[PDB]
Amino acid sequence: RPDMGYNTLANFRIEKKIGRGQFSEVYRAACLLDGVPVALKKVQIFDLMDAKARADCIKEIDLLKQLNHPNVIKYYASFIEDNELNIVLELADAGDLSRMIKHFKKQKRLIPERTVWKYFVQLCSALEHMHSRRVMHRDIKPANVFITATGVVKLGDLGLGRFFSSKTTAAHSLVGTPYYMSPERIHENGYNFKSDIWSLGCLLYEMAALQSPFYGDKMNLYSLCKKIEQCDYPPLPSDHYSEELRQLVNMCINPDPEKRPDVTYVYDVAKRMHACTASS
Amino acid sequence: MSYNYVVTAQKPTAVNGCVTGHFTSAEDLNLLIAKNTRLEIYVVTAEGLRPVKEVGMYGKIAVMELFRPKGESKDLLFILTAKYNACILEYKQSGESIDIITRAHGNVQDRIGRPSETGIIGIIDPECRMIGLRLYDGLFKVIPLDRDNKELKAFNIRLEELHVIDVKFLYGCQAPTICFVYQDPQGRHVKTYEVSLREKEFNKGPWKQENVEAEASMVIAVPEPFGGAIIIGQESITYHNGDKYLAIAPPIIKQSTIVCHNRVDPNGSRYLLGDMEGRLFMLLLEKEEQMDGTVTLKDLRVELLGETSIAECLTYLDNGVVFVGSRLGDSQLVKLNVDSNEQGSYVVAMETFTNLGPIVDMCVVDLERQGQGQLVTCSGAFKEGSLRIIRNGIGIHEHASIDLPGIKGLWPLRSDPNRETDDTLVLSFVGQTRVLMLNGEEVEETELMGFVDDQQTFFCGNVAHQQLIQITSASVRLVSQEPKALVSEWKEPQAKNISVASCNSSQVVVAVGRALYYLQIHPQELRQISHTEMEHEVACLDITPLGDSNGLSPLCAIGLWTDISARILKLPSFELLHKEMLGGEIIPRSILMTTFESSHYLLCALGDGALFYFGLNIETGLLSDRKKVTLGTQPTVLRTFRSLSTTNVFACSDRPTVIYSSNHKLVFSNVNLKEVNYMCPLNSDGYPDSLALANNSTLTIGTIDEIQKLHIRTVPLYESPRKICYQEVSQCFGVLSSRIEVQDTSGGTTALRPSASTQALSSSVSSSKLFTSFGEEVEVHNLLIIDQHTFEVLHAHQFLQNEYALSLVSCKLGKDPNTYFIVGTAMVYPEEAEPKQGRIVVFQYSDGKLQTVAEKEVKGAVYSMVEFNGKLLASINSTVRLYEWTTEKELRTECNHYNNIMALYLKTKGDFILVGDLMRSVLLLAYKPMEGNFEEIARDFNPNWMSAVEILDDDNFLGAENAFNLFVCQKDSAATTDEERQHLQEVGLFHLGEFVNVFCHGSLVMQNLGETSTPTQGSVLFGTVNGMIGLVTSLSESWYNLLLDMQNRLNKVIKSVGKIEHSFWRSFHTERKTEPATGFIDGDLIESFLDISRPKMQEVVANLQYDDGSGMKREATADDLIKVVEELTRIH
Amino acid sequence: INFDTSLPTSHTYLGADMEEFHGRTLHDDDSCQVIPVLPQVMMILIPGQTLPLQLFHPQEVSMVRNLIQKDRTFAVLAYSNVQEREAQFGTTAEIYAYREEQDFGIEIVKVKAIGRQRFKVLELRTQSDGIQQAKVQILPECVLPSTMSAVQLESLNKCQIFPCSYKWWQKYQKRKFHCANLTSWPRWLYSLYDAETLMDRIKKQLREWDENLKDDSLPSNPIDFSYRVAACLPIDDVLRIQLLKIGSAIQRLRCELDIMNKCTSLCCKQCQETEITTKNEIFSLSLCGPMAAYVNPHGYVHETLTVYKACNLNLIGRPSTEHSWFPGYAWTVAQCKICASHIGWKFTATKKDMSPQKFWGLTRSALLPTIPDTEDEISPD
Ligand SMILES: CCN[C@@H]1CC[C@H]2CC[C@@H]1N2c1ccc2c(c1)C(=O)N([C@H]1CCC(=O)NC1=O)C2=O
């Protein structure tokens, strides 16, 4: 029904399934009014969260509605239908950041330093957008950093999956290894704006060394906490990356959130540095 | 709730049809005329035009023509109304009762049909067997003429041709053939038929179609012997008889299209043509061909005769006299002398019928006399622009003014035997009587030896038998003519004094004390033949000669001081002729026997302001004729002077009340004079037919005006009048004019003829720097300023090129000491459909010049400009805009309001605003100074064309709409829900039968309180394109309930011309719906109740229940209606 | 522009030709009627326009089947506010073309409808089955005689029929409104309320959007030409409502002629500030005009306005023929740069020989006319 436009299931035609989380499922589809590719995120709130938890989730979703930036996935609409909160976003099927990281790992070739700063500044701009409006991400990782063939970086999965998992903190150890855990999150001190930059620093190191800062073969969650608390990670090479690249990740990957600087400091460094290698 | 009342203060004056025939009987040359509803039949005679009859036509006339059937000794008439009421008349006079009885009548309109574009054309069969009417397109209405069809029952003949411009029946045909020119995509063709009654259809004609001039307009069926038909176009004329075909190309017809035609010869050897501009063309047909005794055409020579008024319907009266009927000019009467050639014209004007239409804008004002309105209107069109200054009264122009300390008595004296002209006008002071010598300009007081000086003159005049009687209050000292010696001096035997010295042509009867005796002026002597005394003192003595004899007075009527009654008794005896019941308290002031129209009358003017109008019997006895029309409220005197070959008796009073009878009923044309105490005719050698206005301020002498109901002035402008506004302080008017100027090959435009704008004493051209082909016409708009006394154009203001002036307002704004002339121009361009840059310009008349002390620039076009309580409310395009006149003299916009419609009309009262567009979208806005912004209350929308609108009171709004109708609107204040408060209710429906252009608030009477107020409230007047100036004034619920319940009772007795009912005539007219007229009262029908006959007044009222003052009084006699109906007639 | 503009009018995108009906149905003026209402119709249907529908709900197919044997006339409520199904006026539409197809085992009908008469609804009742029946009071189409009829001289009536058109139009005012010197109003004003002059000024603008000739396509009747313009006007819902209530076509032409004048700029309806296209860039691709009602493969129309250049759009997707409304044309989907609404598609020519190459297909339901500068949108008459 065009009267509500993007706000009904009958307008949309489901093609296949592209994602399946613990609580929510991600699909790629289109709408028989425009055909625009989208990202449908279906969750069953009636069976997972109480009435109180829905108010905060709805209010946070309303904050993401105002999030309008080319470097961030645009929010089309959010609605409830068939006892499911259906959320439609901008579909980015060209791949994610972790795809080329694995690709360069297969090639066994270190990603050029000039290339790293080309898109990291774009991600910093995306991180600046929701941090300026008092919105956190909680899921900053190469998995939800998508790039098209044009070289434009979008940041998706704005913590929607992590909002429903707040009651299943112990369940994070059975589905994947959370290499991007912040010291304030594991200690159950609560999530803050310093956790996003902590993941960004872990993201920035992974983009250079093609590995997680706290990666380990046959490594258990207790061992992950010790490395995170001690910030024990292999040093980045100096011949391929300058001091500014290594110094920037030092502050972001810090046990103390207060020491970690603000996004404006990182974004300003992102703009100045990338311009140097653009003409180099 | 409106409960209104509409009367006609001026009948229509512009004609829409004019014919000639023998209507009254066989040997007459009638000139029938129909202006709009006034069928004014005449009789043409060598003396001129002699009026015969005018009738009440209940409908808008459009077709009129005189046709004589076979077996009938005089022409009949065909009458068809714009409402399609058709009736055929028949003049008839039975001794005196001239009755235009109707042979046939009926309606000839059909259920469904689209009225044609070229209007309605009605023509008759020259054999008088067919009525040819083209009402709707693609359908011909024909009716068989016979005794059986007295209802005008119709049969129809389907036409397979849509366009038909002009259709005429043909001459010289065995069966009636019609010849018409009609437009088709191929071209203009002239085709015919043979209408037959036996098959009720059409048949083949005498010839086929022809390709003719691209602008062929009308046919003119030439009569026998030629036959056939002539077709006139914009370019050339042609002749179409079948085999024959002639056509000439005259170069002098190219100026304008030929519109009006007339035949000035019974055999068609000549024709009379007239164009739009109103110039005369002589079309001649030559029968020079003579085959074997039969004659046919040789050429179609066309001549130019002269320039007349802009013509609508021409007509030839015998001896070369033509009535040039007009609608937007002055109807004329011109002799077509064939040897004149004085400058190139065969035309010289004899008569002129004053024409009020077209009235565009008017302002009710008080030029001279305060408290009375003298309406000024803008009339005419193109070259015939003129001002119709209507006034309701008959004034006097005093040619002399001599200061007299309260002249108590004046009378003419002729101390000159064999003179036949006034010589002396002796005055009468409080205790003195000065005798003045007045032959030419002499005003010296010369006392004769045969007359005393220390007495109060009561009768100083001339009698036969060579005796001059100068009767004073002391004694009658009769003087002589040649010796001027006192032949006799009849003194009172007891030294008594006469209260008033009354006398006749050959007898003098005074009232000395309480006794009355007659003392005729015996030849060179004086003696008394009677002596008697009445019961009471004779306050008023009146012994004046009757008709014939001229030597004695058959009857004398007197007043009794102790009885206040009319005492009539024989002159040589004391037997009482009659006694009048009417009269009491205040004694009568003057008594006279009046012979208006050879009918004896006697009005008893009292000293308190009551005139007991009545008759008398010269032979024996007297009547009562109970009627007291108030001739003022001050002491009066009845003095009669002829000066016009009729009675012409006028009673002086604080207001001058004149007693004139139109035909047999007195019409009190209340005169215009300061204060008339006593009246005496000054028929001096230097004062022919003049009079001496004896007032208490200064003794004046002069000539009075005619006995006319509404004296209408006129001043020529020679350019179209658009708008007018009255400005009191500057002593002038403001008028908008548009003179057509010809675009030549010079970069400028030359004036066609001199006009008011061209010939104004001062001209100014606007120089605003804030922002073609040859032979084309371009309007130039002007603001003309004209004085109210002499109506001389004092300043013509020339606007910018291609600048249109739409709105006129005169007012003083804000907080300034000088008033302003403010006009709003609207620059319109042929490319730009809707104008986009108007203007507002400030003028202020002072010291003989019009200057632009302020100026405003706007983006649009202004349409209406009122003064909203010190601030100007200009509606630009479709945004009704306010302003605030500031201290820097520059308009500043304060509030705006953007309308869903085009703000064309603007009428404000108090703090309300009325807005309307050209399609009856009436809007009501309220200003809220507590917020500084406009608002809306109710909003009524209806699709219909609207001519002009006016607000009646705080709740009632009136306007004139399409299809000749009047409507009122009213918003109910008791709306329990705002949805009803957002609606303007309608309660007024009325077919005015006219097309209003302007409404104005005022009246043409002397504004009188009446102590107990008046039935009417408010006074609004409306003009028209014909000139039917009228009046609608609100009424009470019970006043309107009485009038309505008796107007319905009028129509059951009084019959109309054509048996057209009043319900049908007045009903609401729209192209799609008809509704009975409600909430309006017809004053013209109501005033016509007076002239009805006495036994019919008994049938009018039988269960009326008139009185509401503590008792219905269902009888209501007959005079109770005359108490109210006469009261109504005083509002105009 | 070699598109053969007759193609969108034929509606060849709906499959085989529908069954045509020859009978014409009309209701009396001011009459009290009962008419069915289509539950899933939201278009402001101007009478004189053909509206094609595809029905998927069984009730809709059942409703039309009942009407097929009946007069084949149904109402189109012009919902001023669509959320609460509130309607104050409407339009009675007739059905002349329909076709039933048993696609995928279900009965699907594709029906063309023609609107005839505007009307006023007095009561909104819903039956037990869920089908809406509306009380009908037909607005009478007021016919107005010329504004010079009552003030015309009966003698000059023979000059009122007539045989560089600017000089001819100058010669049309000076010979039909010559009697303006009797009344208070000028010549040029009287023409502004005359039908035969408004349609001239409307044709002038339309020729800037189409290369057709006025004699054949654009009608001569003032009533017909009034509804024809209103339907083919690129306007929103609100501006098209006021053109449905107006009773006399003389007012409607003045309102539309003002709509086409002031509304020089267009913006999205969810932004009210993001310009999308203008009126000069509009060009015609159908005999109905640039505007032509197409239906999406699931009973969903898409009035579309083809313009040369459109801005503030971000291109999504790849050119797919799928159900290309313009034959031979693929398209690239675009959405609003700010409010993320669906503005319209960008069509591209797969064949280089045919013209035009690129033209934007914008649905009407997401465009808002807007006066430039800063002033309220007012439509006189
Ligand atoms: C039915 C499946 N379809 C495909 C899978 C869904 C999505 C993505 C590709 C394609 N698709 C469309 C969705 C909506 C529409 C169209 C395709 C389409 O073509 N239109 C219009 C507009 C263009 C045109 O000119 N004519 C149309 O019919 C739609 O509304």
UniProtKB/Swiss-Prot annotation, chain A:
EC number of this enzyme: 2.7.11.34
Effect of mutating I147F: Does not affect interaction with NEK9
Keyword ATP-binding found: yes
Region of interest (NTE motif), residue spans: 1-11
Name of a matching Pfam family: Pkinase
Record PTM: Phosphorylation at Ser-173 required for its activation.
Organ and tissue specificity: Highly expressed in lung, muscle, testis, brain, heart, liver, leukocyte and spleen. Lower expression in ovary, prostate and kidney. No expression seen in small intestine.
Annotated catalysed reactions: L-seryl-[protein] + ATP = O-phospho-L-seryl-[protein] + ADP + H(+); L-threonyl-[protein] + ATP = O-phospho-L-threonyl-[protein] + ADP + H(+)
Family: Belongs to the protein kinase superfamily. NEK Ser/Thr protein kinase family. NIMA subfamily.
Name of the protein this chain belongs to: Serine/threonine-protein kinase Nek7
Organism: Homo sapiens
Swiss-Prot record, chain B:
Alphabetical UniProt keywords: Acetylation, Biological rhythms, Cytoplasm, Disease variant, DNA damage, DNA repair, DNA-binding, Host-virus interaction, Intellectual disability, Isopeptide bond, Nucleus, Phosphoprotein, Repeat, Ubl conjugation, Ubl conjugation pathway
Modified residues (Phosphothreonine): T1117
Numbered residues of crosslink Glycyl lysine isopeptide (Lys-Gly) (interchain with G-Cter in SUMO2): K1113
UniProt modified residues of type N-acetylserine: S2
Pathway(s) served: Protein modification; protein ubiquitination
GO cellular component: chromosome, telomeric region; Cul4-RING E3 ubiquitin ligase complex; Cul4A-RING E3 ubiquitin ligase complex; Cul4B-RING E3 ubiquitin ligase complex; cytoplasm; extracellular exosome; extracellular space; nucleolus
Residue span of region WD repeat beta-propeller C: 709-1035
Region (Interaction with CDT1 and CUL4A): 771-1132
Region entry Interaction with CDT1, spans: 2-768
Superkingdom to which the source organism belongs: Eukaryota
Single annotated GO MF: ubiquitin ligase complex scaffold activity
Subcellular location: Cytoplasm; Nucleus
Subunit details: Component of the UV-DDB complex which includes DDB1 and DDB2; the heterodimer dimerizes to give rise to a heterotetramer when bound to damaged DNA. The UV-DDB complex interacts with monoubiquitinated histone H2A and binds to XPC via the DDB2 subunit. Component of numerous DCX (DDB1-CUL4-X-box) E3 ubiquitin-protein ligase complexes which consist of a core of DDB1, CUL4A or CUL4B and RBX1. DDB1 may recruit specific substrate targeting subunits to the DCX complex.
Disease in which the protein is involved: White-Kernohan syndrome: An autosomal dominant disorder characterized by global developmental delay, variably impaired intellectual development, hypotonia, and characteristic facial features. Some patients may have genitourinary and skeletal abnormalities.
Protein name: DNA damage-binding protein 1
Lineage of the organism: Eukaryota, Metazoa, Chordata, Craniata, Vertebrata
Curated annotation (Swiss-Prot), chain C:
Function of the protein: Substrate recognition component of a DCX (DDB1-CUL4-X-box) E3 protein ligase complex that mediates the ubiquitination and subsequent proteasomal degradation of target proteins, such as MEIS2, ILF2 or GLUL. Normal degradation of key regulatory proteins is required for normal limb outgrowth and expression of the fibroblast growth factor FGF8. Maintains presynaptic glutamate release and consequently cognitive functions, such as memory and learning, by negatively regulating large-conductance calcium-activated potassium (BK) channels in excitatory neurons.
Keyword Kinase annotated: no
Positions bound to (S)-thalidomide: H323, W325, W331
Disease as annotated in the protein's UniProt record: Intellectual developmental disorder, autosomal recessive 2: A disorder characterized by significantly below average general intellectual functioning associated with impairments in adaptive behavior and manifested during the developmental period. MRT2 patients display mild intellectual disability with a standard IQ ranged from 50 to 70. IQ scores are lower in males than females. Developmental milestones are mildly delayed. There are no dysmorphic or autistic features.
PANTHER family the UniProt entry points to: CEREBLON, PROTEIN CEREBLON
Domain CULT, chain residue ranges per copy: 263-371
GO MF: metal ion binding; transmembrane transporter binding
Cross-referenced InterPro entries: CULT, Lon_prtase_N, Lon_prtase_N_sf, PUA-like_sf, Yippee/Mis18/Cereblon
Pathway participation: Protein modification; protein ubiquitination
Record-linked PROSITE patterns: CULT (PS51788), LON_N (PS51787)
Source organism superkingdom: Eukaryota
Domain notes: The CULT domain binds thalidomide and related drugs, such as pomalidomide and lenalidomide. Drug binding leads to a change in substrate specificity of the human DCX (DDB1-CUL4-X-box) E3 protein ligase complex, while no such change is observed in rodents.
Protein name stated in the entry: Protein cereblon
Principal localisation: cytoplasm
Pfam name, any one: Yippee-Mis18
UniProt domain Lon N-terminal: residue ranges: 35-264
Binding site for Zn(2+): C268, C271, C336, C339
Locations listed in the record: Cytoplasm; Nucleus; Membrane
SUPFAM superfamilies, per the entry: PUA domain-like
